[PDB]
Design a protein around this ligand. Structure first.
Ligand code: DMA
Ligand code: DMA
Ligand code: DMA
Ligand code: DMA
Ligand SMILES: [Mg+2]
Ligand SMILES: [Mg+2]
Lengths: 303, 303
């Protein structure tokens, strides 16, 4: 890392510490199944940018004082892991033969390729449910926990992430317009990204309705940008760099298919610019939060 | 109905009222998907004995006074519906082509037969997540809600229902012993049945650790009995009576395959007898609870 403020340095360190927490997270299963214990958490451990926990932590590390943060660190990490579990579950089900049929994710074989289809369906299911187990076991105030579960379940469920996925699959042959593809991407991807942001504020304990509505809106815009960049990743990166299977392009609905690569790059660059401009509005009122988010987004936007 | 006490009559009425609540439960989805709104709740509406909500209500109606119950009825019904949603999700994923490949459930076509495989996977996922949305939106005390989510997620997840399902599918060709099949059935089926029982006590607000441990143990024993009777249902009932596809018998692990029908009936009859005998221990201390559970189990055990 370069020359960073104490606040930003603290945030970076917590992201590393969360990765250790995730790596040392063991679930003990006693049964006569040969591999279920290992295969359950395998996809979480396999890799990932941890973008959503980083979003969660960016809000949280900036809003609560380091000493007040310290006692509840493990509990905050449980919440961050619950977001990652739900995200990982969606990846597993996304890669299914009946869905996107992918053989590789996070530089490793997919659960249905290594084991079988059934195993992949069921572990996806397990991680879906496990997200809420982790959340309910985090030792924060009860009303905070309830509110966190409300957010994760609304955004990750039928009105959010799943609507996006169902649209993506149903209209895989139908060419959609830009407004429809934007809607799809907002649901498929942006909903969970905005959830991560507002869950941070909720987990902090701080009442701030104005900031809540800001973070939620920011996440939808930035989450759309995230997916547009992901669509570009498919044609610009090989499997060794992306960690995941390159889809056969024209078979599905992406920004690159709709606009062509050159126009999609233009759309993405101007979307990036607006995202970072919106982030400047945080700087007077919430400078510590701006700092964390700006650093996270610069790292993402560099490639 | 026959001649029942006010308490038992109240319980019967609440079960009917919950069915109305479920039937009038609407989720509004605005999107350009032609059928997702309808298909989401379709399998819940299609039918079912509502055995698990009835278990939940049997505990709850008996433990809390009718006037104290009245104000929170809707909230209690949300919790009961969350159990049913999670149960329905497991049915949807159970019937998948890669799993049990069933064309019929609850006297209706399965989601993958009526729509497609992808739709079935995703709606199952949605109902899984939706269970926790319903639970977190029930207006009871926060610490009760957290505790309810803890129970439903532990028992319905990797250490419970899913372990059972993964065992069932992995060892579909391996013939298991009686101890192994019992273990499988306890996880696959009994875990969610015992959850329904203890969730009732938790939802009531009453601290009773002795009753908690009793209900949990009772549910594992009775839930095993439930699955043994279900195994017998496959060979004794046609599709019009069961509402669901008759599996091709010897291909999987059931009590009928392991013991043969005659021995399985003997095992089931003596299991039933022990269940009802265990229920007699409730009668001095918790007579209202005994009454509700005994009536529910007599109805189930009659066929
Ligand atoms: C919706 C979408 C783009 C999922 C892939 O997410 P990601 O780029 O965060 O992958 P990972 O979690 O492996 O970092
Ligand atoms: C919620 C979720 C997993 C969406 C996947 O979208 P995608 O198939 O475009 O993502 P990827 O390119 O990472 O498979
Ligand atoms: C594990 C198992 C036996 C599932 C079928 O449950 P059920 O007999 O309660 O079916 P339904 O929910 O349709 O009444
Ligand atoms: C948790 C769950 C749905 C288990 C199904 O067991 P099964 O396949 O024996 O049940 P059914 O005979 O109802 O399909
Ligand atoms: Mg994909
Ligand atoms: Mg089945």
């Amino acid at each position: 890392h370069s020359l960073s403020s104490p606040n930003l340095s603290f945030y970076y360190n917590e992201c590393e510490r969360f990765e250790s927490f995730l790596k040392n997270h063991h679930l003990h299963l006693e049964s006569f199944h040969p591999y279920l214990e290992k295969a359950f958490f395998e996809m979480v451990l396999n890799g990932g940018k941890r973008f959503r926990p980083k979003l969660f932590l960016a809000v949280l590390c900036a809003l609560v004082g380091q000493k007040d943060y310290s006692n509840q660190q493990t509990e905050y990490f449980k919440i961050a892991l619950s977001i990652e579990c739900l995200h990982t579950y969606s990846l597993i089900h996304d890669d299914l033969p009946c869905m996107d049929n992918a053989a590789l994710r996070r530089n490793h074989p997919t659960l249905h390729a290594k084991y079988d289809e059934t195993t992949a369906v069921l572990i996806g299911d397990a991680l879906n449910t496990y997200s809420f187990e982790l959340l309910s076991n985090a030792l924060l105030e009860s009303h905070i926990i309830v509110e966190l579960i409300k957010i994760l379940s609304a955004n990750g469920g039928i009105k959010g992430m799943i609507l996006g996925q169902a649209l993506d699959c149903y209209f895989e042959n139908t060419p959609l317009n830009l407004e429809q593809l934007t809607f799809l991407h907002e649901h498929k991807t942006a909903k969970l990204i905005s959830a991560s942001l507002i869950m941070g504020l909720v987990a902090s304990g701080i009442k701030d309705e104005e900031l809540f509505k800001w973070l939620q809106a920011f996440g939808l815009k930035m989450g759309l940008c995230f997916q547009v960049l992901d669509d570009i990743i498919d044609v610009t990166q090989d499997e060794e760099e992306s960690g995941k299977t390159t889809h056969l392009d024209s078979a599905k609905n992406s920004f690159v298919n709709l606009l062509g690569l050159e126009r999609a790059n233009n759309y993405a660059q101007t979307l990036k610019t607006e995202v970072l401009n919106d982030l400047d509005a945080l700087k007077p009122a919430y400078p510590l939060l701006q700092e964390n988010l700006n650093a996270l987004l610069n790292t993402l936007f560099k490639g």
